[PDB]
Design a protein around this ligand. Structure first.
Ligand code: DNY
Ligand code: MN
Length: 292
């Protein structure tokens, strides 16, 4: 069975440390860059409202066949997607969705990825820009009303719309509506950028991270074990199908860290930190790459 990797660092900053994100990320860097990913829990009273246009939120999610690599050898609203997502998970595990242990979904996910006897297919609302129906965070752009008690979140530095995105030389957040077993494979960001991820609500998002000092080790294991048909593909195209069990990387000496990102918690990925993961159930996430 799947052996869970060690847990990545979790930080619970005080209200003083929560004042500036870039200053806090720079301070946790000596530890967090050695694990690739880290989790940040805001103070208990920091609860931003959900500001998406729920009435008109409509999308067609992508189809994900979990074992498509091993096999080589519908429009929804937010409500209707949640109904499908909860029905899928409760039927699959034969129990209420909130009662399924996170370790069981994790163990079953990686079994289905390498299973040729069972073909499980899920859907992922992963191609949703914040310009379509608004960001999950409140913003002061006029397109939606802002209550007085919500203005601090529209101006907060932890609002992903207020993160610095311009790199020095001579973009808006994206949304993810997940269900059980919907996943994203191993990849790094463009220009080796940072990324910050916020789970607005729903069941946890399970993460796996590799520190940047082991990036070549991971790419070497990929070169050895990924399907030969995709071996000569460039990294940008290969990372569309870089599905690999974390234990396989750990067996080859690649350090891997995990975490369960729960509602209201941040996940930061450091430069050139390979990461992957899957969703425990119906949830809503927002992500953006930022610069330091
Ligand atoms: O789903 C999440 O919560 C989540 C959390 C963190 N990072 C990501 C990245 C994705 C998705 O790709 C979007 C941008 C990728 N980019 C990287 C390299 C330059 C070109 C393209 C994705 C990737 C692979 C398979 C499925 C999906 Cl959906 N989803 C993520
Ligand atoms: Mn990413």
């Amino acid at each position: 069975e799947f052996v869970p990797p060690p847990e990545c660092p979790v930080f619970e900053p005080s209200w003083e440390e929560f004042t500036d994100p870039l200053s806090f990320i720079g301070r946790i860097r000596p530890l967090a860059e050695k694990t690739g990913i880290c989790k940040i829990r805001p103070p208990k009273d920091w609860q931003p409202p959900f500001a998406c246009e729920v009435k008109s939120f409509r999308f067609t999610p992508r189809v994900q066949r979990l074992n498509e690599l091993e096999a080589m050898t519908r429009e929804y609203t937010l409500q209707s997607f949640g109904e499908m997502a909860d029905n899928f998970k409760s039927d699959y595990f034969n129990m209420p969705v909130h009662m399924v242990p996170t370790e069981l979904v994790e163990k079953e996910f990686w079994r289905l990825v390498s299973s040729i006897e069972e073909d499980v297919i899920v859907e992922y609302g992963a191609d949703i820009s914040s310009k379509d129906f608004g960001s999950g965070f409140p913003v002061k752009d006029g397109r939606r009303k802002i209550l007085p008690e919500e203005e601090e979140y529209a101006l907060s530095g932890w609002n992903l719309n207020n993160m610095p995105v311009l790199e020095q030389s001579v973009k808006v957040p994206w949304l993810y509506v997940g269900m059980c077993f919907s996943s994203f494979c191993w990849h790094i960001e463009d220009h080796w950028s940072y990324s910050i991820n916020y789970l607005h609500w729903g069941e946890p998002k399970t993460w796996y991270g590799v520190p940047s000092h082991a990036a070549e080790q991971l790419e070497e294991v990929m070169r050895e074990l990924a399907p030969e048909l995709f071996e000569s593909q460039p990294d940008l195209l290969h990372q569309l199908v870089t599905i690999m069990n974390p234990n396989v990387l750990m067996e080859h000496g690649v350090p891997v860290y995990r975490t369960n990102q729960c509602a209201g918690e941040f996940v930061v990925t450091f430069p050139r930190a390979y990461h992957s993961g899957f969703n425990q159930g119906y949830n809503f996430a927002e992500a953006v790459n930022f610069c330091t």
